[PDB]
């Protein structure tokens, strides 16, 4: 009935629903875009970033740095957490994780907030999320930087700063990266669940993850209480992706469909952008330049790697190396390979005959793809100049991507290709703006667009729809595209950060079970339809109600039938008094009396007790309890 | 009689019986009779 | 309101595991194994118990295979293709992957080391695999409206 | 040609009934009709020429004819209004105009949002459609328009609610008394959201239907087959109480001449 | 409830010594009846003041005028609707402002038409609620009981005391003296807001709003329609049906105004403003408002003209707009329709007329579109705007 | 009236009690009011009441907490066991009768 | 077991008075081929109503003062009876569910003392015991 939304980020939601007797957390999410306000963390101290001019104000200067007009923070990058203080997270009983992208910020919730509940997620999601936190902690703690910057967080000081730093919100709630001990502790509180697995939460509600088709282990959740069902649609995809397609059927008959994880850059067709990315890197490589591809180690990298494997053979570029640098590179490749049963029917059919599902095993076998754990190992020995490198965080604030941007940024021959849409490629590129590097933005987002979600909504027909307020308006870049909206027959109520929505799905008629012993004693009747009466004792255990074996009446007793039928059913000396809209009947034995009102009857006894029960029973010949 | 009507409803909508169970004796049936 | 269980194989022996369960009018087969050591006519379970000279798909709505051992899935192709069961067959993904090769090896043994007058072939093994529905761990599938 | 009988009363621009006709205002009913009948309108009513023009006293043919196929709901959706209010020329006059200038056999879709409100006393004009029994003084006139026409049902007032002042009969006996075409399409009681498209929903699946029938003489060797089904047709009642069947006594006889 | 008919049947000013037992019994019965009536009134009308600091402090209720009785056929007076409304409400007995005392004989002059489900009891609860005025009047007839009640009211600070304030509010509500109820409403805001006890605090108090609604009903009964409308607008920002919540108080304020307008229209008065108000109020309750709409139509037909500032041009009441459109023709008596100021064209005459080719038609279409767009909006804002902008019509209707 | 606000206020009361452990009369008032709201239908309210009884309590309270080893909600049962454990950690000597009650919960 | 839906209000009222010796009374409506357990009020709301009650006026055998007949007889609930709710009112009456005893004057009918005893079938114990001991169980 309630929904506490702890994050305003659309693709990184954190929603808690105080529905029935359990408060369930839907996703955690970590707004990584706060890192773009900070100066990047380089693997080796660069002269350009160190010698940047401090920003000037009337007062400080060493906290903030200026580069090509944009003003940044000379401090360790910080991450915008979901609102933890709006609702006491100790009361959260269960956390449901949909994607590994939404899996982040979980150490904060599990450790710092006194959360003692359970976390449910699918195994590929858990493993890939573990890899992501591994590489994030490795990048952050590789060359640590102090957190000296705190003056700029002041309420009266942030107003005078330029636009990217002024528009940052919840700055006081930003936190540094969690340590690896917290990551290991958090992942220990997790329960692995398979698709369509019914998990009972204290006998109250049943949750099942349903395949979303967006990523490996990506799942949509449906929470139901046997009469009211709440569907949670996170990032999902209806394309020809490797994971098994969306289970759209199970979302039907949903009272509330909370909808998050819709695509950014809706105007982009992912196949065309993949083709453009391949063509651009082929053009750059043909001219002898290098290519840098900031990406996550386990996200859209696999799809574009497959397309590159197909493309290079026709393009005559098999000679050039395909470097993949990340601390979790080999782990990412192996985890992608072993999760073969988490794929679609086309790709899971490769388990019958002996063959790995993904084709990049063939890239490794022919020594086309070469994965390394860092730059300082065997990579520096096997590095060939006209190459393409997938590495680093797409935020361009830590990882090996910082080093490669600082290295290849001085030449126009080299190019950087952005494929993840979750970071503003002009804002992530801000601390390096005076580069001559050729910068290309061809994001690949396979998530649902507004046409697809409109079709899905018309297919599912949910009673109420909940979405971020960003989807109830056209995007600010366009501001005139009515097609980039969630159009529903209901108004499709929305939310912003730290908003509480009182859902109208409150319904009665909770389910209960009656045992055969009591059902033997229960007998129905006929009315105008069947009906019965039940008197029993209620036994409740684990929020499951059982009916153990130990005022109103209804019928047709009009004045005429009352006077006629029961006139001489056993007594005598009965008179009828001519009362308006009825008749008053009383006996001379002890002035015992019977009075009837419109659609009502009642029996009076005057100094008599033995005949009163039989008087009531006589009228009970044709009186039900409807 | 609430346990009567629902049981009758459940038993009414059922499916065909096994031949061996129809031909069984003392809830046991000889298998591979042709041999 | 009764659960009637009739193990016509592996009742008091090991081998040829094939158990019939009638729970709520839903007749399910719990395994389709075969016996080892028997030469002829007792390798496979007695499917005349389920009204032979008729369509088995009407009687059975679900067939379940525990694992890929021959005493639990060996009679599956003969059963399905020969006696004419076109209904669903449920078995885990590794069971689906490893079941046909065991059947192929035993088929090679039967055609080479013994007689093969009343045995199945590789094409008929592959025909059986079409009806198979893979089920993941803890995947509560809905084989019927009420049976899961 | 055929003209939709729109009410020329001033209340037609505003909602219907004393307090509420059914569900929301007329705009919601028009939108529901457009959404539900769009598939039928685009396939069955492409040649029905109806114009949502303004009228002072009764529906008249002044504007040029147009091929209105999906603008039927627009006639009752944000329609124009005129400074005129003629209650006696709303149904009787429009019906007479349809009978005279359009005939009793013409495709007309009389679907619109109209008040259909009588007076606040002894002023109920029930002779518009119930001239057979009520208002027998005009029984020899052209009323009650005994000719084929589109169904016009005004289920505005509730029979239970209007029975308090003994005025339920006047409001309820409007749709049923309108020539008695087939059956009485009159709903008395509370109103719901789905009731808006109830009137328009009577011909959702009544456009075409499959059938099985073959015409031949005896046995033959080049008998013609008819894949598409024709409209329903029956000559008698006992022989065709259910869908037609084929017997095993086919014979060919008789001379064919013109 | 009916036991006061026997105690009061003896000599009120009896001998102190010769009838000492009778006088003592009468005084005791009168005191008990007064205490019971005060307790019942406090429980029914003062739920916040009767609750302690740790108690729930529920939203208090209030008693309103018997507008349903006037609308109902039980008290269908053909010529006792306009001037006799105050008489029907008070019985011409509670002339003085009696604090902690009810001097009214309306219990015997009329009754409460309550069904089995409308009230808690059709015999006990209704009679007990109606006989409070009669029992209090009987107590006031006896010198000792009246003196005791006066002493209690003086000593207990009846304005501050919860039971005495509730009794005073009920007496003013039935008496029609809106000034006493208004004073009680003003005191119920500061008294509840400045007290450390649990109750409704601030201007948005349930008891204050209920008292304001009671004052509006009393003003309407007294014939001051303008004062009643002002009190109703302020509140918005023997027995009757009304919930104890503050939200339900706002939608019940217009009932008294509708009853007064219906009574005026059904009488010999042809005030078109009352007819317009009744037409606006036709959507408040149905089929009870059908009689009010018929009376409004009759009044409009009899007057032959109407004068208003904004009825269909800006006001977006669906029922009022439909009624005005219907009455524009000869159905409403063939009278001129005035929606805008000095506008409306001719609709009472024959339909075949030109007038303005496209000017008046465009203006009417624009007004109809504006009304349709604002149709979803509540009628309370429109009613308040008409009550301020078009107060001349309301003043004319009131006198 | 509301259950979330009641549970949060019980959390606030627990914080105040832990802020003043040397105050005795305050803790008796706190445990009394925790016992008062211990019968609420909301499992959260009962959880916070049991937490109050565990952190604050004379060292009767074991019987009161022991009564909720049979509560239908499992998390209320966990809260009761944790309250008894925290009472033991504070220095209270638990009764042997708790052994049989805990044995059923295994 | 029989799958049945019980209304939320009745379910909450189950432990509202039955948390600490208790019972649950309701009516099951097997309507529209589904089982829906509800209270009596929702049973009325579903869809033939004809209420039957007891509001008997037993001619009291006790012939004493008006105070004795009215203000002393009505305190006969708390003697030994159980499972009855308690609500205090200053005025003076016993209002536990469909129970009211302070009826009218002690003897209106030209006979002995007359008092109205009212009860329903769920609270039949109190009304039955009261009527039994008021018929002849309170002599002078
Ligand atoms: Zn085995």
Q: Which residues of chain F are within 8 Å of residue A18 when distances are taken between CB atoms?
A: 4
Residue whose structure tokens are 């082929």: A282
Q: Are A89 and A109 in contact (CB under 8 A)?
A: yes
The set of residues, in sequence order, having a beta carbon less than 8 Å from that of A405 and lying 6+ positions away, is A40, A292, A396, A416, A432, A435, A437
Residue whose structure tokens are 């697995």: A197
**C32 CA distance to ligand 1 middle (Å):** 11
| CA-only gyration radius of chain E, Å | 24
Distance CA E172, CA A45 (A): 86
**F41 in G contact zone (CB under 8 Å):** yes
Resolution (A): 3.1
**A197 in C contact zone (CB under 8 Å):** yes
DSSP symbol at A38: B
CB pairs under 8 A between A and F: 20
Q: Are E206 and E46 in contact (CB under 8 A)?
A: no
Angle between helices E20-45 and E162-175 (to 10 degrees): 90
> Smallest CA–CA separation between C60 and chain B, in Å?
10
G115 by DSSP, 3-state: which? Answer: strand
DSSP symbol at G123: T
Q: Tell me which method was used to determine the 3D structure.
A: cryo-EM
Q: Which residues have CB less than 5 Å away from ligand 1 (the ion)?
A: C 69, 71
Burial of A459 (0-12, 13-18, 19+ CB in 10 A): exposed
Of the candidates G78, G64, G80, G83, the residue with the CA atom closest to the CA atom of residue G23: G83
Q: Are E99 and E158 in contact (CB under 8 A)?
A: yes
Q: Are A6 and A84 in contact (CB under 8 A)?
A: yes
User: Does the N-terminal peptide bond of residue E44 adopt cis geometry, omega within 30 degrees of 0?
Assistant: no
Alpha-helical segments (H) within G40-116: 40-46, 66-67
Alpha-helical segments (H) within chain G: 8-18, 40-46, 66-67, 124-135
Candidates G52, G109, G130, partner chain A, best to mutate (most A CBs within 10 A): G52
> Smallest CA–CA separation between F69 and chain A, in Å?
12
Which residues on adjacent β-strands are paired with residue E317?
none
What token pair was written down for C41?
Answer: 């006519």
| CA dist list (Å): E344 to B14, D90, E307, E311 | 74, 21, 11, 11
CA-CA-CA-CA torsion sign (E329, E331, E335, E336):
negative
Q: Are A297 and A135 in contact (CB under 8 A)?
A: yes
Distance CA C37, CA C46 (A): 16
Distance CA A616, CA A606 (A): 14
CA dihedral E226, E232, E233, E234 (to 10 degrees): 110
Q: Which residues of chain E are within 8 Å of residue D16 when distances are taken between CB atoms?
A: 322
Answer yes or no: do D18 and E321 touch at CB < 8 A: no
Answer yes or no: do B29 and C20 touch at CB < 8 A: no
Distance CA E392, CA A130 (A): 77
Residues 317-346 of E with CB under 8 A from D: 318-319, 321-323, 325-326, 328-332, 345-346
Answer yes or no: do G12 and F39 touch at CB < 8 A: no
- Residue count of chain C: 148
Q: How far apart are the first and last CA of chain D?
A: 37
Q: Is A507 annotated among the ligand-binding residues?
A: yes
Helix H, strand E, coil C: the string for chain C is: CCCEEEEEECCCCCCCCEEEEECCCCEEECCCCCCCCCCCCCCCCCHHHHCCCCCHHHHEEEEECCCCCHHHHCCHHHHHHHHCCCCCEEECHHHHHHHHHHHHHHHHHHHHCCCCCCCCCHHHHHHHHHCEEECCCCCCCCCCCCCC
Distance CA A447, CA A449 (A): 6
| CA dist list (Å): E309 to B17, D5, E273, E303, E341 | 84, 35, 11, 18, 6
| CA dist list (Å): A475 to A165, A168, A266, A422, E373 | 21, 18, 9, 14, 28
| CA dist list (Å): C21 to A324, C31, E108, E143 | 54, 11, 81, 93
Residues 3-32 of B with CB under 8 A from G: 3, 6
Distance CA A319, CA A215 (A): 31
A111 by DSSP, 3-state: which? Answer: helix
CB-nearest partner of D164 from E283, E290, E360: E290
Nearest residue of chain C to residue B15 (CA atoms): C25
- For C62, half-sphere exposure in the C-beta direction (CA atoms, 13 angstrom radius) is 23
Of the candidates A95, A108, A129, A128, the residue with the CA atom closest to the CA atom of residue A185: A108
CA-CA-CA-CA torsion sign (D224, D228, D234, D237):
positive
Distance CA A298, CA A218 (A): 13
Answer yes or no: do B3 and A532 touch at CB < 8 A: no
Q: Are D12 and D51 in contact (CB under 8 A)?
A: no
The secondary element (H helix, E strand) that includes residue A403 is helix A400-408
Q: Is A370 annotated among the ligand-binding residues?
A: no
The set of residues, in sequence order, having a beta carbon less than 8 Å from that of D176 and lying 6+ positions away, is D184, D185, D186
Q: Are D18 and D126 in contact (CB under 8 A)?
A: no
What token pair was written down for E363?
Answer: 């203006």
């Amino acid at each position: 009935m309630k929904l506490y939304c702890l994050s305003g980020h659309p693709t990184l939601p954190c929603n808690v629903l105080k529905f029935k007797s359990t408060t369930i957390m839907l996703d955690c999410g970590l707004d990584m875009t706060s890192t773009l306000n900070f100066l990047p963390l380089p693997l080796v101290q660069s002269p350009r970033l160190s010698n940047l001019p401090g920003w000037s104000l009337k007062d400080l200067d060493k906290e903030l740095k200026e580069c090509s007009g944009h003003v940044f923070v000379d401090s360790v990058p910080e991450f915008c957490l979901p609102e933890t203080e709006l609702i006491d997270l100790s009361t959260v009983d269960v956390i449901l994780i949909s994607n590994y992208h939404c899996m982040m910020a979980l150490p904060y919730i599990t450790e710092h907030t006194g959360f003692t509940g359970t976390v449910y997620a699918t195994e590929p999601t858990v493993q890939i999320g573990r890899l992501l936190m591994e590489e994030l902690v490795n990048f952050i703690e590789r060359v640590p930087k102090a957190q000296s910057a705190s003056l700029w967080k002041n309420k009266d000081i942030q107003r005078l700063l330029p636009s990217p730093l002024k528009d940052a919100v919840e700055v006081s709630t930003w936190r540094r990266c969690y340590t690896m001990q917290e990551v290991n502790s958090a992942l220990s509180k997790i329960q692995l669940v398979g698709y369509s697995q019914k998990i009972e939460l204290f006998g109250a509600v049943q949750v099942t993850p349903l395949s979303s088709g967006y990523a490996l282990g990506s799942s949509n959740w449906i929470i139901q209480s046997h009469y009211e069902k709440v569907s949670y649609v996170s990032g999902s995809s209806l394309l020809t992706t490797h994971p098994q397609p969306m289970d759209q059927a199970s979302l039907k008959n949903s009272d509330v469909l909370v909808l998050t994880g819709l695509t950014q850059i809706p105007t982009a067709n992912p196949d065309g952008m993949v083709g453009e990315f391949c063509s651009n890197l082929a053009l750059t490589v043909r001219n002898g330049g290098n290519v840098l591809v900031p990406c996550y180690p386990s996200g859209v990298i696999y799809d574009l790697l497959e397309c590159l494997y197909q493309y290079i053979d026709s393009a005559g570029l098999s000679s050039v190396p395909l470097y993949f640098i990340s601390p979790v590179a080999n782990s990412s490749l192996e985890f992608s390979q072993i999760f073969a049963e988490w794929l679609c029917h086309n790709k899971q059919s490769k388990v019958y005959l002996p063959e790995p599902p993904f084709p990049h095993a063939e890239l490794i076998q022919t020594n086309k793809l070469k994965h390394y754990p860092s730059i300082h190992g065997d990579f520096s020995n096997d590095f060939r100049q006209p190459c393409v490198v997938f590495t680093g965080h797409p935020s361009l604030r830590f990882g090996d991507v910082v080093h490669f941007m600082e290295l290849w940024g001085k030449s126009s021959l080299n190019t950087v290709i952005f494929t993840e849409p979750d970071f503003s490629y002009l804002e992530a590129l801000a601390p390096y703006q005076p580069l001559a590097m050729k910068c290309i933005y061809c994001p690949i987002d396979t998530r649902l667009n507004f046409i697809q979600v409109s079709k899905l909504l018309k297919e599912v027909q949910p009673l109420h729809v909940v979405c971020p307020e960003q989807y109830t308006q056209p995007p600010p870049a366009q501001s005139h595209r009515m097609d980039l909206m969630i159009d529903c027959q209901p108004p499709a109520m929305s939310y912003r950060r730290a908003e509480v929505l009182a859902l109208p799905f409150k319904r009665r008629y909770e389910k209960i079970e009656i045992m055969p012993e009591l059902a033997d004693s229960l007998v129905p009747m006929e009315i105008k339809i069947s009906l019965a009466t039940v008197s029993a004792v209620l036994h409740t255990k684990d929020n499951k109600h059982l009916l153990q074996p130990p005022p109103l009446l209804s019928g047709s007793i009009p004045v005429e039938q009352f006077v006629q039928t029961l006139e001489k059913h056993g007594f005598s000396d009965i008179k009828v008094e001519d009362t308006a809209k009825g008749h008053i009947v009383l006996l001379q034995e002890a002035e015992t009396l019977i009075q009837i009102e419109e659609d009502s009857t009642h029996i009076i006894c005057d100094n008599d007790e033995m005949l009163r029960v039989r008087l009531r029973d006589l009228v009970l010949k044709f009186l039900q309890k409807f | 009689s609430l346990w009567s009507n629902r049981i009758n409803t459940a038993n009414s909508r059922k499916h065909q019986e096994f031949a061996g169970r129809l031909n069984s004796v003392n809830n046991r049936a000889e298998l591979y009779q042709h041999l | 309101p009764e659960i009637r269980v009739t193990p016509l194989g592996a009742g008091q022996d090991v081998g040829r595991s094939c158990i019939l369960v009638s729970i709520a009018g839903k007749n399910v087969m719990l395994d389709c194994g075969m016996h080892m050591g028997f030469n002829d006519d007792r390798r496979f379970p007695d499917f005349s118990y389920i009204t032979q000279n008729g369509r088995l798909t009407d009687f059975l709505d679900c067939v379940i295979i525990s694992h890929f051992h021959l005493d639990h899935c060996g009679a599956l192709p003969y059963f399905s293709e020969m006696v004419g069961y076109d209904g669903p067959i449920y078995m885990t993904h590794p069971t689906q992957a490893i079941c046909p090769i065991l059947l192929e090896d035993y088929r090679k043994i039967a055609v080479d080391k013994k007689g093969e007058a009343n045995f199945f072939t590789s094409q008929m093994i592959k025909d059986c695999m079409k009806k198979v529905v893979a089920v993941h761990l803890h995947q509560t599938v809905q084989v019927d409206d009420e049976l899961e | 040609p055929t003209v939709v009988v729109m009410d020329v009363s001033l209340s037609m621009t505003r909602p219907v009934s004393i307090e509420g006709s059914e569900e929301y205002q007329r705009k919601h009913l028009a939108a529901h009709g457009l959404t539900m009948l769009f598939e039928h309108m685009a396939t069955n009513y492409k040649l029905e020429f109806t114009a949502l023009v303004v009228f002072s006293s009764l529906w008249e043919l002044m504007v040029p004819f147009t091929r209105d196929y999906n603008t039927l709901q627009e006639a009752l959706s944000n329609m124009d209004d005129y400074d005129k209010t003629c209650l006696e020329s709303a149904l009787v006059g429009v019906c007479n105009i349809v009978q005279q200038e359009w005939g009793g056999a013409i495709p007309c879709q009389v679907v619109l949002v109209t008040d259909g409100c009588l007076g606040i006393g002894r002023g109920s004009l029930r002779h518009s459609l119930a001239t057979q029994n009520q208002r027998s003084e005009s029984n020899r006139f052209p009323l009650p328009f005994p000719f084929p026409s589109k169904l016009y049902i005004m289920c505005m007032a509730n029979l239970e609610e209007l029975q308090s002042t003994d005025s339920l009969e006047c409001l309820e006996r409007l749709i049923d008394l309108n020539n008695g075409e087939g059956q009485i399409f009159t709903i008395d009681g509370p109103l719901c959201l789905k009731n808006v498209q109830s009137m328009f929903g009577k011909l959702i699946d009544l456009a075409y239907t499959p059938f099985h029938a073959v015409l031949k003489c005896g046995h033959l060797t080049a008998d013609v087959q008819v894949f598409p089904r024709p409209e329903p047709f029956v000559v008698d009642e006992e022989i065709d109480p259910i869908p037609k069947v084929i017997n095993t006594d086919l014979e060919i006889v008789g001379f064919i001449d013109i | 409830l009916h036991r006061m008919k026997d105690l009061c049947r003896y000599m009120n000013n009896f001998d102190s010594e010769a009838h000492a037992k009778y006088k003592n019994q009468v005084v005791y019965s009168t005191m008990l009846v007064f205490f019971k009536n005060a307790f019942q009134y406090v429980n029914s009308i003062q739920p916040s003041l009767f609750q302690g600091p740790n108690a729930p402090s529920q939203v208090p209720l209030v008693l309103l005028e018997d507008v349903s009785n006037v609308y109902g056929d039980v008290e269908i007076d053909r010529n006792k609707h306009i001037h006799k409304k105050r008489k029907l409400a008070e019985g011409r007995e509670k002339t003085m402002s009696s604090d902690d005392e009810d001097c009214s004989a309306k219990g015997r002059n009329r009754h409460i038409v309550v069904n089995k489900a409308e009230l808690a009891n059709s015999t006990e609860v209704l009679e007990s609620f109606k006989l409070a005025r009669e029992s209090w009047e009987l107590l006031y007839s006896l010198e000792f009981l009246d003196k005791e009640f006066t002493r209690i009211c003086l000593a207990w600070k009846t304005d501050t005391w919860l039971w005495l304030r509730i009794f005073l509010t009920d007496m003013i509500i039935y008496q029609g003296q809106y000034k006493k109820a208004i004073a009680s409403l003003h005191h119920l805001a500061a008294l509840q807001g400045s007290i450390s006890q649990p109750q409704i605090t601030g201007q948005g108090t349930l008891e204050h709003q209920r008292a304001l609604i009671q004052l509006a009903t009393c003003h309407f009964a007294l014939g001051e329609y303008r004062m009643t409308c002002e009190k109703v607008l302020d509140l918005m920002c023997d027995l009757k049906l009304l919930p104890c919540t503050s939200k339900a108080i706002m939608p019940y304020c217009l009932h008294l105004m509708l009853a007064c307008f219906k009574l005026r229209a059904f009488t010999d008065n042809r005030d078109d403003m009352a007819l317009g108000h009744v037409i606006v109020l036709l959507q408040q309750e149905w089929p009870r408002g059908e009689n009010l709409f018929l009376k409004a139509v009759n009044k409009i037909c009899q007057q032959g003209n109407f004068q208003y500032e904004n009825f269909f041009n800006y006001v977006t009441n669906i029922d009022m707009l439909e009624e005005f459109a219907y009455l524009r023709t000869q159905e409403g008596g063939k009278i001129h329709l005035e929606l805008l100021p000095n506008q409306g064209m001719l609709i009472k005459h024959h339909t075949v007329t030109r007038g303005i080719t496209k000017g008046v038609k465009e203006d009417f279409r624009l007004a109809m579109e504006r009304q349709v767009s604002r149709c979803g909006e509540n009628l309370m804002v429109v009613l308040h705007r008409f009550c301020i902008n078009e107060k001349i019509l309301l003043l004319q209707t009131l006198t | 009236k509301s259950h979330q606000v009641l549970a949060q206020l019980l959390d606030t009361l627990l914080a105040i009690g832990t802020k003043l452990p040397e105050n005795q009369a305050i803790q008796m008032r706190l445990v009394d009011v925790a016992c008062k709201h211990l019968t609420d239908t909301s499992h959260g309210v009962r959880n916070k009441c049991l937490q109050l009884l565990g952190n604050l309590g004379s060292l009767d309270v074991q019987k009161i907490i022991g009564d909720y080893f049979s509560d239908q909600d499992p998390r209320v049962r966990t809260a009761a066991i944790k309250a008894m454990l925290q009472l033991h950690e504070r220095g209270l000597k638990l009764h042997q009768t708790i052994y049989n009650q805990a044995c059923k919960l295994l | 077991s029989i799958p049945v839906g019980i209304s939320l209000g009745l379910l909450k009222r189950e432990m509202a008075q039955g948390l600490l010796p208790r019972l649950l009374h309701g009516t099951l409506i097997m309507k529209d081929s589904n089982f829906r357990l509800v209270s009596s009020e929702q049973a009325l709301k579903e869809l033939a109503e004809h209420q039957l009650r007891f509001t008997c006026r037993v001619h009291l055998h006790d012939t004493r003062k008006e105070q004795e007949t009215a203000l002393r007889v009505y305190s006969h609930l708390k003697s030994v009876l159980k499972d009855h709710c308690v609500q205090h009112l200053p005025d003076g009456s016993v209002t536990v569910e469909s129970v009211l005893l302070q009826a009218a004057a002690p003897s209106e009918d030209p006979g002995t003392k007359v008092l109205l005893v009212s009860w329903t079938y769920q609270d039949e114990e109190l009304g039955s015991f009261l009527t039994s001991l008021l018929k002849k169980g309170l002599p002078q």
